[PDB]
Amino acid sequence: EMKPHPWFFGKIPRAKAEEMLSKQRHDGAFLIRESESAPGDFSLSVKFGNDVQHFKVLRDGAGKYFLWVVKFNSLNELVDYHRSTSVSRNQQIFLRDIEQV
Ligand SMILES: [Cl-]
Distance (angstroms) between ligand 1 centre and the Cα of 86 equals: 4
DSSP result, the chain:
-----TTB--S--HHHHHHHHTT--STTBEEEEE-SSSTT-EEEEEEETTEEEEEE-EE-TTS-EESSS-EESSHHHHHHHTTTS-S-SSS----B-----
Q: What CATH superfamily is the domain 1-101?
A: SH2 domain (3.30.505.10)
| 76, 5 contact by CB (below 8 A) | yes
Residues whose beta carbons lie less than 5 angstroms from ion ligand 1: 85-86
Please give the distance, rounded to the nearest whole angstrom, from the Cα atom of residue 76 to the centre of ligand 1: 18
Q: How far is the CA of 90 from the centre of ligand 1 (A)?
A: 11
Domain ranges within the chain, ordered by starting residue: 1-101
What is the stated resolution of the deposited model, in angstroms?
A: 1.7
Question: What is the rounded radius of gyration, in angstroms, for the C-alpha atoms of the chain?
Answer: 13
CA of 67 to the centre of ligand 1 (A): 13
